[PDB]
């Protein structure tokens, strides 16, 4: 019941999935074989007549490598071979290859496997899509998939966990194109999207975890802690709180304004000695500092249309209120005059579980702050500029066109992006 099927597309998608999935296993005492010694986790895990618990997930990729690393992996037994779908040729950083040329060949088989995972759902809430904005599979295939589930599952909830490209964290010259094309094609099909700016994750490892050159493992594990916090409200059931979808209602005032900004706290290096531990208000304040944001933007300058706090570990309302009050006095948190000034609060019981032999330290209490600020539109604007720069000259556009696409698609996608920027301008008016 209240079922939730996860989908991991491309290199970024799959590797984040693995980070998520090992952590999930830890949170619910699940061993890499599947066996385990709150029935609520079943929303994510199917169970067999043998007692093995299998994730309600699908790993897709247009090339073998990444998925094969799972197949020969430490969790080779955690999934069905059926639920790990690979191609033979990647989308070579081309949305038009992911969406058309190459992905067309895999789509039907994928949807077919998603349907088999669906048939085991007494009452499916929806889908969680993990992809890259940059990769040809993370961009093109994802859009194709979202488009097809909107036909297949209709108005069923579709969530995103997208990875906003950053120069510091790999990236390729053509990613701004792939980034814009996906957002556009996906817009209609998405109920709500969690944008993750790789630079932020980079900057957090670099500053809080003290990692001169962070590994994808260091990034991905960090990301997982934020994601598991967003999904705690589904894999766990507490009297205390834990209640997504209700957040979704506050966060989304209008269909297209569905991208919250996540600010997680605390990120502590597993070498920060004496520490142990922090107060509720310390972590509550941490949320308002930009140096904790998942996406690099400036909400001090924009306006708010929602604010949600997702507490976990050892949190009591007494001091949440106290904290929330001290904040609400300060005038930098300016909301629009069309929505209330309250912050929607949810509290978990299960303390943040940390990865054995990890980079992060064990915390008595962690928080994730989801909010609808007009300032996220800065990420769009950033991406758009790089798009405009190249497109102005049609640099690399031949690759798309050669794969079947039309110049028109870029303009269509770009106008959409521009309208989305206007939508955020319009919405922040009082």
């Amino acid at each position: 019941m209240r079922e939730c099927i996860s989908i991991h597309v491309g290199q970024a998608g799959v590797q984040i999935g693995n980070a998520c999935w090992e952590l999930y296993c830890l949170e619910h005492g699940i061993q890499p074989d599947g066996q385990m010694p709150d029935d609520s986790f079943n929303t994510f895990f199917s169970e067999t007549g043998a007692g093995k618990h299998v994730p309600r997930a699908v790993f897709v990729d247009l090339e073998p490598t990444v998925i094969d690393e799972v197949r020969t992996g430490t969790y080779r037994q955690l999934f069905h071979p059926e639920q790990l779908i690979t191609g033979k040729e990647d989308a070579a950083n081309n949305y038009a290859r992911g969406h058309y040329t190459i992905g067309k060949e895999i789509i039907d088989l994928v949807l077919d496997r998603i349907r088999k995972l669906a048939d085991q759902c007494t009452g499916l809430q929806g889908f969680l899509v993990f992809h890259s904005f940059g990769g040809g599979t993370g961009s093109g295939f994802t859009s194709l998939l979202m488009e097809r589930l909107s036909v297949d599952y209709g108005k069923k909830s579709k969530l995103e966990f997208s990875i906003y490209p950053a120069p510091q964290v790999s990236t390729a010259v053509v990613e701004p194109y792939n980034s814009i094309l996906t957002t556009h094609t996906t817009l209609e099909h998405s109920d709500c999207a969690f944008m993750v700016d790789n630079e932020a994750i980079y900057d957090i490892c670099r500053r809080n975890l003290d990692i001169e050159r962070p590994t994808y493992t260091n990034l991905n594990r960090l990301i997982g802690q934020i994601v598991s916090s967003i999904t705690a409200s589904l894999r766990f059931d507490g009297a205390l709180n834990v209640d997504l979808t209700e957040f979704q209602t506050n966060l989304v005032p209008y269909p297209r304004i569905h991208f919250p900004l996540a600010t997680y706290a605390p990120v502590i290096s597993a070498e920060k000695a004496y520490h142990e531990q922090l107060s509720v208000a310390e972590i509550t304040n941490a949320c308002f500092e930009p140096a904790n944001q998942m996406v690099k933007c400036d909400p001090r300058h924009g306006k708010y249309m929602a604010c949600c706090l997702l507490y976990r570990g050892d949190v009591v309302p007494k001091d949440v209120n106290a904290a929330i009050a001290t904040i609400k006095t300060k005038r930098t948190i300016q909301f629009v005059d069309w929505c209330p000034t309250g912050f929607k609060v949810g509290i978990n019981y299960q303390p943040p579980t940390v990865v054995p032999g990890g980079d992060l330290a064990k915390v008595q209490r962690a928080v994730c702050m989801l909010s609808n600020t007009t300032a996220i539109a800065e990420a769009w604007a950033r991406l758009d500029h790089k798009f405009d720069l190249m497109y102005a000259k049609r640099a690399f556009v031949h690759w798309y066109v050669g794969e079947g696409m039309e110049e028109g698609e870029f303009s269509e996608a770009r106008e959409d992006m521009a309208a989305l920027e206007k939508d955020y301008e319009e919405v922040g008016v009082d």
């Binding site: 009452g123 209602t249 209008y254 007494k318 069309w338 929505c339 929607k344």
Partner: protein, 428 residues
């Protein structure tokens, strides 16, 4: 005879307390059996309980929820073992704080399933008075289905009476943005489909807990304690044998002078804290003026901003009937400006020798004051705040709805406020 329907998180929680509060007053142990002292308790037991011989006393209640959660809480609850299993009517897809989901799409699927239950529960009554609904107006199940239920019931038993314990939302208690939409849409349906409506404002219950009860961090248990207190006090004349000797329809005939104006301001004195501490008796005036003061009202309206059309006031325990009558007439002779003159002896007082649990003297108040328009304006303002910009509306239009239906709900409610401001200005 009375049939009790409870809808949603709030509705069942509120209801479950009223059911456990009254069971103590009636000697019904959580295993459904009479263990009370005096036969005065069993005298009017047939109003709320049925016999399953037994003896076994089963509450004449229907438990309704579009998701399981809350039902299971009661099932696993303290008094829970009391309800008929055949009376837990729930769904699996929870309406999720959407009036549209509860009233339209979702609730419609579970509606007939519930109604068939109420059909059954009504066959077992010699002569039913009407129905009693406990529900909130901010969520989906209680807000939407609760209204829908009322409407389908009205359609099945026109002649029967419609009583509601509607918990009005506030921006203070709960943070679900959509709340004014749900509330306004529910209110629109209550104005037309119920006969008596007990207007419990969460804004008020929180302020009472916070300021008066000194409760630093109030809980739902705390808010609900005050609701349960009143819910028993307003039903004192139905389940307890006195010189009254009245019912639900006589109460309506006497309280409601104009059909639409039927929303009452509940009020209790003394305002007891949970568990702690009792001690020291109340003087008659102490009990009377406290009760007539605004800091004792479960609705967030200043009664000094309106005029009382009609007032009902039950006093419990052993007290001088003289002293109480003396205090009532004193109060009316003092604050005559705020009582309609064109309705003679419009303040009625009741008494009951058996005092409530823990407090050995209490007084429940029911006022039909023009001041209640303040509660509606408060809601209509919050509605229009979001509504001018058409914010969050998508969640409803997705459920098959029209903007027209929002316009109407506010318009029908704005008309209600203009209706209260006729008799608010009127003399004799």
């Amino acid at each position: 005879e009375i049939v009790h329907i409870q809808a949603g998180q709030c509705g069942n929680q509120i209801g479950a307390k009223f059911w456990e509060v009254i069971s103590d007053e009636h000697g019904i142990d959580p295993t459904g059996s009479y263990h009370g002292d005096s036969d005065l308790q069993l005298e009017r037991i047939n109003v709320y309980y049925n016999e399953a011989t037994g003896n076994k006393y089963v509450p004449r209640a229907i438990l309704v929820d579009l998701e399981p959660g809350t039902m299971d809480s009661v099932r696993s609850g303290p008094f829970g073992q009391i309800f008929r299993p055949d009376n837990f009517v729930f769904g699996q897809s929870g309406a999720g704080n959407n009036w549209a989901k509860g009233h339209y799409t979702e609730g419609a699927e579970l509606v007939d399933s519930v109604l068939d239950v109420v059909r059954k529960e009504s066959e077992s009554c010699d002569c039913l008075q009407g129905f009693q609904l406990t529900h909130s107006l901010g969520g989906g199940t209680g807000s939407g289905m609760g209204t829908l239920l009322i409407s389908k019931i009205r359609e099945e038993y026109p002649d029967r009476i419609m009583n509601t314990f509607s918990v009005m939302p506030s921006p203070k208690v709960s943070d679900t943005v959509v709340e004014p939409y749900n509330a306004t849409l529910s209110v629109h349906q209550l104005v037309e489909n119920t006969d008596e409506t007990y207007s419990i404002d969460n804004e008020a219950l929180y302020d009472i807990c916070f300021r008066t009860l000194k409760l630093t961090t109030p809980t739902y248990g705390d808010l609900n304690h005050l609701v349960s207190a009143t819910m028993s006090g307003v039903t004192t004349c139905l389940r307890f044998p006195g010189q009254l000797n009245a019912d639900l329809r006589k109460l309506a005939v006497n309280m409601v002078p104009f059909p639409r104006l039927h929303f009452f301001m509940p009020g209790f004195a003394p305002l007891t804290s949970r568990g702690s501490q009792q001690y020291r008796a109340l003087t008659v005036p102490e009990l009377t003026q406290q009760m007539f003061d605004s800091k004792n009202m479960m609705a967030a309206c200043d009664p000094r901003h309106g005029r009382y059309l009609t007032v009902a006031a039950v006093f419990r325990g052993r007290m001088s009937m003289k002293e109480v009558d003396e205090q009532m007439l004193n109060v009316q002779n003092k604050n005559s400006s705020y009582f309609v003159e064109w309705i003679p002896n419009n303040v009625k007082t009741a008494v009951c020798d058996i005092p409530p649990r823990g407090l050995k003297m209490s007084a429940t108040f029911i006022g039909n004051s023009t001041a209640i328009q303040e509660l509606f304006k408060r809601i209509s303002e919050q509605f229009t705040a979001m509504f001018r910009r058409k914010a969050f509306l998508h969640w409803y239009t997705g459920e098959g709805m029209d903007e027209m239906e929002f316009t109407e709900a506010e318009s029908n409610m704005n008309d209600l406020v203009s209706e209260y401001q006729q008799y608010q200005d009127a003399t004799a």
